């Protein structure tokens, strides 16, 4: 029963799809977003009309996310 | 270069995790918590980092 912690300890782990690139492709649906994939992989999900893998909501857009 | 900055606390309040992504155009700057970022959007203040107008706040999760 893995509940995510308060702070995003896994933010530095690689994209869960390609397993090499940083998590910078935020999958946005409504006012929430799941950030577990890189921009390239997340764009491919939307291009191929696939839903967000985590919550299964339709993907409205991918936001290229920076962490300044 | 992986986002180690993402694990630091909200730049504005220093006590909450960075889950308020500030969207502008097709990009987002994630450095503030949702509460602080929403206060900025409600007051039509710009992104703290790049000072561009805020399109929306995305409540962000790291699953
Ligand atoms: Cl300001
Ligand atoms: Zn990827
Ligand atoms: Zn989702
Ligand atoms: Zn804050
Ligand atoms: Zn910005």
Numbering used by the authors:
A (entry chain B): 424 to 491
B (entry chain A): 429 to 491
Would you copy out the relevant sentences from the publication that reported this structure?
The most prominent regulator of p53 is the Ub ligase (E3) MDM2, which binds to the transactivation domain of p53 through its N-terminal p53-binding domain, thereby inhibiting p53’s transcriptional activity. Furthermore, MDM2 catalyzes ubiquitination of p53, where monoubiquitination promotes nuclear export of p53 and polyubiquitination leads to proteasomal degradation. Here, we show that S429 phosphorylation selectively enhances MDM2 homodimer E3 activity, but has no effect on MDM2-MDMX heterodimer E3 activity.
Since flexible or disordered regions usually lack electron density in crystal structures, we also crystallized and determined the structure of cat MDM2-422–C-S429E to 1.21 Å. Despite contributing to crystallographic contacts, the region preceding the RING domain is able to adopt the same 310-helical turn configuration independent of E2–Ub binding.
